[PDB]
C-alpha cells in the first residue's frame, strides 16, 4: 500500500482562524454633529433632568 | 462472521502503482479452515487508496460437493476501514452479483456492467466476498481467490 | 457527425507507460445526450503513440429500450488526427465487429483476432465507435465506455 491520512480520519489536523469577521455597524445619521445643547443644533438636548 | 485474509490483517502488503493509469494486480487468496456458510463476509483483499477496478478475475476450487449446488459468491466493496474485526460491516454486489463460481470450481471474469463503474475514494477500502446462499455440502479446505486489476490516478 | 469525448478534444488526458511491456489502462467514456442513430461515429478515446491494444472491454449500457433490439456497435481506429472535427473520418472494425452488446446492456470483451494484431504508428490514433445498425428506439442519456490495455514498446 501507501500511507494515506485520508480526509475524514481523526488524525487529519484542522486549524481555526483567530480573527473574527464582523457585521460593521450601520452608520448612524444623527451623530454628535447634530445633537448639541446649543441653539444651532438640529436635535437639541434638554439638560434639565440630568442632575435633578 | 468475518474470515480475514492475510492482506486484510496487513501481514502481506498489497501492491500500489506509481505511474498514473498503470495496471497492477496481486491475487487475493485465502485458505478456508472451515466450510463456508451463509453470512461469512470473507475479506479477501484490499483496494488501495485511489484505485478503481478495471478487471476482476475470480477463481475458486470446487466449493460444493452436492448435486445441484446452491453456493453463490457476491464480490463487492466493504464499508469500514481495513482490518477492523467488527461484524457490523456490509459487503457489496458490485464486482459480482450472485455469481456461480463455487458450484463447479471454474473461473469467471467481471461480467457485470457495475464492476468498472466503481468510483474513487481517498482511504483504503476492502474487497470482500459474501456467500449469499449457503452450500448444500460445504468443503473443508478449498481456496477462494480474487485477482483485481486496479489503476491509480484515474480521472 | 462526430460526438467527441473529453479525451479526444484534449480536456481529459490519456496515460502513457514509461516502460516497454507495461499494461496501462484508462476507461474511455462518453455521456452522449442524444439517442444514437445509424451512421453516427463516436470518438471515445485516443490510442497514444507507439501502442497496441491488448484487451478491449466494452462497457455500453442499454441503448435500445424498445422491442426487438437492433443496435450493433463496432469499434476501430479512426484515420485522421485526434482533434480534427471533420465529419468525414472513417472508422475501422478491428477491436469489435458488429458487437451485439448494447441491445441488453453489459460487458463484452474482445473476441476477434484483429483486436490483438494492431500495428503501431508514430502519431496519435483515436479509437472511434460506429453504430452499424440504427436502434429501434434509441435511449437518450445512457453512457458507452471502452477500456484499452494498450502497451508501448512492442515489436
Short mmCIF file of C-alpha atoms in Angstrom, two decimals:
data_model
loop_
_atom_site.label_atom_id
_atom_site.label_comp_id
_atom_site.label_asym_id
_atom_site.label_seq_id
_atom_site.Cartn_x
_atom_site.Cartn_y
_atom_site.Cartn_z
CA UNK A 1 0.00 0.00 0.00
CA UNK A 2 0.95 3.61 0.64
CA UNK A 3 0.30 5.66 3.76
CA UNK A 4 -2.77 7.88 3.48
CA UNK A 5 -4.07 10.23 6.17
CA UNK A 6 -7.34 10.47 4.19
CA UNK A 7 -9.86 13.28 4.70
CA UNK A 8 -12.22 12.13 7.46
CA UNK A 9 -9.63 10.28 9.55
CA UNK A 10 -9.28 11.51 13.15
CA UNK A 11 -5.57 12.18 12.53
CA UNK A 12 -6.19 14.98 9.99
CA UNK A 13 -5.39 18.21 11.82
CA UNK A 14 -7.62 21.27 11.46
CA UNK A 15 -6.79 24.87 12.35
CA UNK A 16 -9.18 27.61 13.44
CA UNK A 17 -8.83 31.26 12.48
CA UNK A 18 -8.45 33.54 15.49
CA UNK A 19 -9.66 36.67 13.70
CA UNK A 20 -13.41 37.24 13.53
CA UNK A 21 -15.48 38.58 10.67
CA UNK A 22 -17.97 41.13 11.99
CA UNK A 23 -21.09 42.91 10.77
CA UNK A 24 -19.99 46.53 10.56
CA UNK A 25 -22.35 48.79 12.48
CA UNK A 26 -24.92 50.58 10.35
CA UNK A 27 -23.70 54.17 10.04
CA UNK A 28 -25.95 56.35 12.20
CA UNK A 29 -27.04 59.60 10.57
CA UNK A 30 -27.62 61.57 13.80
CA UNK A 31 -24.03 61.61 15.04
CA UNK A 32 -22.54 64.07 17.53
CA UNK A 33 -22.63 66.86 14.93
CA UNK A 34 -26.39 67.34 15.22
CA UNK A 35 -27.31 66.53 18.83
CA UNK A 36 -25.94 69.58 20.62
CA UNK A 37 -27.11 71.60 23.60
CA UNK A 38 -26.55 74.84 21.68
CA UNK A 39 -29.39 76.53 19.83
CA UNK A 40 -27.94 75.91 16.35
CA UNK A 41 -28.27 72.14 16.53
CA UNK A 42 -30.80 70.01 14.66
CA UNK A 43 -31.62 67.80 17.66
CA UNK A 44 -31.48 69.99 20.75
CA UNK A 45 -30.67 68.41 24.11
CA UNK A 46 -32.62 69.35 27.24
CA UNK A 47 -30.33 69.17 30.27
CA UNK A 48 -32.98 69.80 32.93
CA UNK A 49 -33.48 66.30 34.35
CA UNK A 50 -29.87 65.14 34.18
CA UNK A 51 -28.88 66.21 37.70
CA UNK A 52 -32.40 66.64 39.14
CA UNK B 1 -18.77 -13.77 10.51
CA UNK B 2 -15.53 -12.17 9.30
CA UNK B 3 -12.98 -14.55 7.82
CA UNK B 4 -9.95 -12.30 7.36
CA UNK B 5 -7.28 -12.84 4.73
CA UNK B 6 -3.57 -12.18 5.01
CA UNK B 7 -3.90 -8.87 3.16
CA UNK B 8 -6.78 -7.61 5.32
CA UNK B 9 -4.78 -8.04 8.53
CA UNK B 10 -1.79 -6.41 6.87
CA UNK B 11 0.85 -9.13 7.04
CA UNK B 12 1.08 -9.07 3.23
CA UNK B 13 1.30 -5.53 1.87
CA UNK B 14 -0.79 -5.07 -1.27
CA UNK B 15 0.93 -3.50 -4.30
CA UNK B 16 0.10 0.04 -5.40
CA UNK B 17 1.20 1.58 -8.72
CA UNK B 18 3.29 4.71 -9.08
CA UNK B 19 2.61 5.84 -12.64
CA UNK B 20 -0.90 7.07 -13.32
CA UNK B 21 -3.01 4.77 -15.44
CA UNK B 22 -0.70 1.83 -14.80
CA UNK B 23 -2.36 -1.54 -14.21
CA UNK B 24 -1.34 -3.56 -11.16
CA UNK B 25 -2.65 -6.85 -9.84
CA UNK B 26 -1.96 -9.17 -6.92
CA UNK B 27 -4.06 -12.29 -6.45
CA UNK B 28 -6.02 -12.05 -3.20
CA UNK B 29 -6.46 -15.52 -1.73
CA UNK B 30 -7.35 -17.37 1.47
CA UNK B 31 -7.16 -20.93 2.77
CA UNK B 32 -10.58 -21.69 4.24
CA UNK B 33 -10.02 -23.53 7.52
CA UNK B 34 -13.69 -24.47 7.83
CA UNK B 35 -16.64 -24.99 5.48
CA UNK B 36 -18.19 -21.75 4.20
CA UNK B 37 -21.77 -21.00 5.19
CA UNK B 38 -24.19 -18.16 4.54
CA UNK B 39 -23.26 -14.84 6.12
CA UNK B 40 -19.47 -15.23 6.02
CA UNK B 41 -18.14 -11.83 4.91
CA UNK B 42 -14.75 -13.08 3.74
CA UNK B 43 -12.44 -10.05 3.49
CA UNK B 44 -10.41 -11.44 0.58
CA UNK B 45 -8.34 -8.34 -0.08
CA UNK B 46 -7.98 -4.58 -0.15
CA UNK B 47 -8.25 -2.00 -2.90
CA UNK B 48 -5.65 0.73 -2.27
CA UNK B 49 -6.31 4.42 -1.74
CA UNK B 50 -7.05 5.93 -5.16
CA UNK B 51 -7.93 2.97 -7.34
CA UNK B 52 -10.78 1.63 -9.43
CA UNK B 53 -11.17 -1.99 -10.59
CA UNK B 54 -10.63 -2.41 -14.31
CA UNK B 55 -10.94 -6.19 -14.44
CA UNK B 56 -11.70 -8.74 -11.73
CA UNK B 57 -10.91 -12.44 -12.19
CA UNK B 58 -12.48 -14.69 -9.56
CA UNK B 59 -11.30 -18.30 -9.33
CA UNK B 60 -12.23 -20.87 -6.68
CA UNK B 61 -11.76 -24.56 -6.13
CA UNK B 62 -14.83 -26.78 -6.07
CA UNK B 63 -16.59 -25.26 -3.06
CA UNK B 64 -19.66 -27.53 -3.15
CA UNK B 65 -19.82 -31.31 -3.46
CA UNK B 66 -23.56 -31.84 -3.81
CA UNK B 67 -25.91 -32.38 -6.70
CA UNK B 68 -27.48 -29.11 -7.83
CA UNK B 69 -25.22 -26.96 -5.63
CA UNK B 70 -26.52 -23.60 -4.45
CA UNK B 71 -23.40 -21.81 -3.17
CA UNK B 72 -23.00 -18.38 -4.75
CA UNK B 73 -20.38 -15.70 -4.18
CA UNK B 74 -21.01 -11.95 -4.15
CA UNK B 75 -17.92 -9.75 -4.50
CA UNK B 76 -18.02 -6.09 -3.57
CA UNK B 77 -16.55 -3.21 -1.62
CA UNK B 78 -16.95 -3.05 2.15
CA UNK B 79 -17.78 -0.07 4.32
CA UNK B 80 -15.46 0.34 7.28
CA UNK B 81 -11.68 0.67 7.47
CA UNK B 82 -9.41 -2.23 6.60
CA UNK B 83 -8.65 -4.72 9.36
CA UNK B 84 -11.49 -3.80 11.73
CA UNK B 85 -12.83 -7.06 13.19
CA UNK B 86 -16.36 -5.74 13.64
CA UNK B 87 -19.35 -7.81 12.46
CA UNK B 88 -21.17 -4.57 11.57
CA UNK B 89 -19.60 -4.44 8.10
CA UNK B 90 -21.54 -4.93 4.87
CA UNK B 91 -20.33 -6.28 1.54
CA UNK B 92 -21.36 -5.25 -1.96
CA UNK B 93 -22.66 -6.80 -5.16
CA UNK B 94 -20.61 -4.58 -7.49
CA UNK B 95 -17.78 -6.75 -8.83
CA UNK B 96 -20.01 -9.85 -9.00
CA UNK B 97 -23.73 -10.41 -8.47
CA UNK B 98 -24.88 -13.89 -7.42
CA UNK B 99 -22.07 -15.49 -9.39
CA UNK B 100 -21.92 -19.29 -9.50
CA UNK B 101 -18.17 -19.85 -9.50
CA UNK B 102 -18.21 -22.17 -6.50
CA UNK B 103 -20.66 -24.72 -7.92
CA UNK B 104 -18.06 -26.30 -10.22
CA UNK B 105 -14.82 -24.56 -9.24
CA UNK B 106 -14.50 -22.76 -12.57
CA UNK B 107 -13.19 -19.30 -13.38
CA UNK B 108 -15.30 -16.33 -14.45
CA UNK B 109 -14.36 -12.70 -15.02
CA UNK B 110 -16.14 -9.45 -14.21
CA UNK B 111 -19.27 -9.66 -16.38
CA UNK B 112 -21.41 -7.04 -14.61
CA UNK B 113 -21.73 -3.53 -16.01
CA UNK B 114 -21.41 -2.09 -12.50
CA UNK B 115 -17.96 -3.64 -12.00
CA UNK B 116 -15.94 -0.97 -13.82
CA UNK B 117 -18.07 1.99 -12.68
CA UNK B 118 -16.72 1.96 -9.11
CA UNK B 119 -15.87 5.49 -8.01
CA UNK B 120 -12.71 6.51 -6.20
CA UNK B 121 -12.19 7.09 -2.50
CA UNK B 122 -9.32 8.53 -0.51
CA UNK B 123 -8.93 5.72 2.05
CA UNK B 124 -8.12 2.02 1.73
CA UNK B 125 -11.37 0.16 1.06
CA UNK B 126 -11.58 -3.61 1.48
CA UNK B 127 -12.92 -6.00 -1.16
CA UNK B 128 -14.80 -8.85 0.48
CA UNK B 129 -16.81 -11.81 -0.79
CA UNK B 130 -20.08 -12.87 0.82
CA UNK B 131 -21.74 -16.25 0.29
CA UNK B 132 -25.31 -15.19 -0.50
CA UNK B 133 -26.62 -18.77 -0.48
CA UNK B 134 -25.23 -21.49 1.78
CA UNK B 135 -23.77 -24.58 0.12
CA UNK B 136 -25.55 -27.91 0.31
CA UNK B 137 -22.32 -29.62 1.44
CA UNK B 138 -19.52 -27.26 2.42
CA UNK B 139 -15.93 -28.09 1.53
CA UNK B 140 -13.26 -28.34 4.20
CA UNK B 141 -10.13 -26.60 2.96
CA UNK B 142 -10.59 -25.16 -0.51
CA UNK B 143 -9.33 -21.72 -1.53
CA UNK B 144 -11.18 -18.64 -2.77
CA UNK B 145 -9.00 -16.24 -4.73
CA UNK B 146 -9.69 -12.87 -6.35
CA UNK B 147 -7.49 -11.03 -8.84
CA UNK B 148 -8.03 -7.27 -9.03
CA UNK B 149 -6.76 -5.13 -11.91
CA UNK B 150 -6.85 -1.62 -10.45
CA UNK B 151 -5.37 1.61 -11.78
CA UNK B 152 -4.28 4.66 -9.79
CA UNK B 153 -4.85 8.28 -10.68
CA UNK B 154 -7.81 7.76 -12.98
CA UNK B 155 -9.93 10.80 -13.79
CA UNK C 1 -21.41 13.66 -37.05
CA UNK C 2 -18.61 13.15 -34.54
CA UNK C 3 -19.57 13.11 -30.87
CA UNK C 4 -16.17 13.97 -29.41
CA UNK C 5 -15.29 12.84 -25.89
CA UNK C 6 -13.29 14.78 -23.34
CA UNK C 7 -10.35 12.52 -24.25
CA UNK C 8 -10.35 13.34 -27.96
CA UNK C 9 -10.67 17.11 -27.61
CA UNK C 10 -7.74 17.26 -25.19
CA UNK C 11 -9.54 18.06 -21.92
CA UNK C 12 -9.08 14.69 -20.21
CA UNK C 13 -5.72 13.08 -20.91
CA UNK C 14 -4.57 9.53 -21.51
CA UNK C 15 -1.73 7.79 -19.65
CA UNK C 16 1.39 6.51 -21.39
CA UNK C 17 3.65 3.81 -19.90
CA UNK C 18 7.23 4.78 -19.13
CA UNK C 19 8.50 1.22 -19.60
CA UNK C 20 8.12 -1.16 -22.52
CA UNK C 21 5.81 -4.04 -21.74
CA UNK C 22 3.66 -2.34 -19.10
CA UNK C 23 -0.11 -2.64 -19.49
CA UNK C 24 -1.73 0.75 -18.90
CA UNK C 25 -5.47 1.32 -18.92
CA UNK C 26 -7.80 4.30 -18.84
CA UNK C 27 -11.51 3.77 -19.30
CA UNK C 28 -12.57 5.95 -22.22
CA UNK C 29 -16.15 7.06 -21.61
CA UNK C 30 -18.71 9.48 -23.00
CA UNK C 31 -22.19 10.58 -21.96
CA UNK C 32 -23.97 11.06 -25.27
CA UNK C 33 -27.11 13.13 -24.75
CA UNK C 34 -28.92 12.03 -27.93
CA UNK C 35 -30.24 8.66 -29.00
CA UNK C 36 -27.63 7.12 -31.33
CA UNK C 37 -28.66 6.99 -34.98
CA UNK C 38 -27.33 4.95 -37.88
CA UNK C 39 -24.07 6.32 -39.26
CA UNK C 40 -23.06 8.12 -36.06
CA UNK C 41 -19.35 7.90 -35.25
CA UNK C 42 -18.32 8.31 -31.60
CA UNK C 43 -14.70 9.17 -30.78
CA UNK C 44 -14.27 7.59 -27.35
CA UNK C 45 -10.55 7.96 -26.82
CA UNK C 46 -7.04 8.23 -28.20
CA UNK C 47 -4.57 5.34 -28.53
CA UNK C 48 -1.34 7.19 -27.75
CA UNK C 49 1.96 6.86 -29.56
CA UNK C 50 3.60 3.52 -30.29
CA UNK C 51 0.98 1.43 -28.53
CA UNK C 52 -1.17 -1.54 -29.49
CA UNK C 53 -4.38 -2.81 -27.86
CA UNK C 54 -4.09 -5.99 -25.82
CA UNK C 55 -7.58 -6.33 -24.32
CA UNK C 56 -10.69 -4.27 -25.09
CA UNK C 57 -13.54 -4.26 -22.56
CA UNK C 58 -16.66 -2.54 -23.87
CA UNK C 59 -18.99 -1.18 -21.18
CA UNK C 60 -22.04 0.07 -23.05
CA UNK C 61 -25.35 0.41 -21.22
CA UNK C 62 -28.82 -0.35 -22.62
CA UNK C 63 -29.01 1.73 -25.80
CA UNK C 64 -32.27 0.23 -27.14
CA UNK C 65 -35.35 0.40 -24.92
CA UNK C 66 -37.97 -0.78 -27.42
CA UNK C 67 -38.96 -4.19 -28.75
CA UNK C 68 -36.60 -6.41 -30.72
CA UNK C 69 -33.25 -4.63 -30.28
CA UNK C 70 -31.26 -3.91 -33.43
CA UNK C 71 -28.23 -1.82 -32.43
CA UNK C 72 -24.83 -3.29 -33.35
CA UNK C 73 -21.82 -1.28 -32.25
CA UNK C 74 -18.39 -1.75 -33.75
CA UNK C 75 -15.13 -0.02 -32.90
CA UNK C 76 -11.89 0.67 -34.74
CA UNK C 77 -9.03 3.07 -35.32
CA UNK C 78 -10.07 6.34 -36.95
CA UNK C 79 -7.82 7.69 -39.67
CA UNK C 80 -7.29 11.41 -39.24
CA UNK C 81 -5.64 13.28 -36.38
CA UNK C 82 -7.06 13.07 -32.89
CA UNK C 83 -8.54 16.54 -32.58
CA UNK C 84 -9.86 17.49 -36.01
CA UNK C 85 -13.66 17.72 -36.06
CA UNK C 86 -14.14 16.69 -39.69
CA UNK C 87 -17.34 14.63 -40.15
CA UNK C 88 -15.70 12.66 -42.98
CA UNK C 89 -13.39 10.42 -40.97
CA UNK C 90 -13.68 6.65 -41.35
CA UNK C 91 -13.89 4.03 -38.61
CA UNK C 92 -12.47 0.53 -38.82
CA UNK C 93 -13.76 -2.74 -37.39
CA UNK C 94 -10.64 -4.01 -35.63
CA UNK C 95 -11.31 -4.38 -31.90
CA UNK C 96 -15.02 -5.15 -32.29
CA UNK C 97 -17.06 -6.03 -35.38
CA UNK C 98 -20.86 -5.82 -35.24
CA UNK C 99 -20.66 -6.19 -31.47
CA UNK C 100 -24.09 -7.02 -30.10
CA UNK C 101 -23.60 -5.51 -26.64
CA UNK C 102 -25.91 -2.55 -26.01
CA UNK C 103 -29.04 -4.39 -27.11
CA UNK C 104 -29.41 -5.57 -23.49
CA UNK C 105 -26.54 -3.82 -21.73
CA UNK C 106 -23.44 -5.27 -20.14
CA UNK C 107 -19.79 -6.04 -20.79
CA UNK C 108 -18.27 -7.80 -23.80
CA UNK C 109 -14.54 -8.40 -24.21
CA UNK C 110 -12.54 -8.75 -27.40
CA UNK C 111 -13.43 -11.88 -29.37
CA UNK C 112 -11.98 -11.10 -32.82
CA UNK C 113 -8.42 -11.96 -33.82
CA UNK C 114 -7.99 -8.47 -35.30
CA UNK C 115 -8.23 -6.90 -31.83
CA UNK C 116 -4.73 -8.03 -30.85
CA UNK C 117 -2.81 -7.69 -34.15
CA UNK C 118 -2.96 -3.89 -34.39
CA UNK C 119 0.08 -2.22 -35.92
CA UNK C 120 1.96 0.66 -34.34
CA UNK C 121 2.01 4.23 -35.60
CA UNK C 122 4.19 7.18 -34.64
CA UNK C 123 1.23 9.60 -34.49
CA UNK C 124 -1.75 9.57 -32.11
CA UNK C 125 -4.66 7.46 -33.32
CA UNK C 126 -8.17 7.89 -31.94
CA UNK C 127 -10.44 4.92 -31.25
CA UNK C 128 -13.91 5.51 -32.68
CA UNK C 129 -17.31 3.87 -32.23
CA UNK C 130 -19.58 3.40 -35.23
CA UNK C 131 -23.19 2.26 -34.82
CA UNK C 132 -23.66 -0.10 -37.75
CA UNK C 133 -27.41 -0.61 -37.29
CA UNK C 134 -29.79 2.09 -36.11
CA UNK C 135 -31.54 1.49 -32.80
CA UNK C 136 -35.22 0.64 -32.97
CA UNK C 137 -35.91 3.10 -30.12
CA UNK C 138 -32.72 4.83 -29.04
CA UNK C 139 -32.14 5.63 -25.38
CA UNK C 140 -31.13 9.19 -24.60
CA UNK C 141 -28.99 9.61 -21.51
CA UNK C 142 -27.05 6.34 -21.33
CA UNK C 143 -23.26 6.11 -21.49
CA UNK C 144 -20.89 3.95 -23.53
CA UNK C 145 -17.37 3.21 -22.34
CA UNK C 146 -14.39 1.31 -23.73
CA UNK C 147 -11.24 0.27 -21.86
CA UNK C 148 -7.92 -0.27 -23.66
CA UNK C 149 -5.00 -2.25 -22.26
CA UNK C 150 -2.57 -0.58 -24.64
CA UNK C 151 1.13 -1.36 -24.17
CA UNK C 152 4.06 0.60 -25.57
CA UNK C 153 7.43 -0.61 -26.82
CA UNK C 154 6.18 -3.77 -28.52
CA UNK C 155 7.73 -5.31 -31.64
#
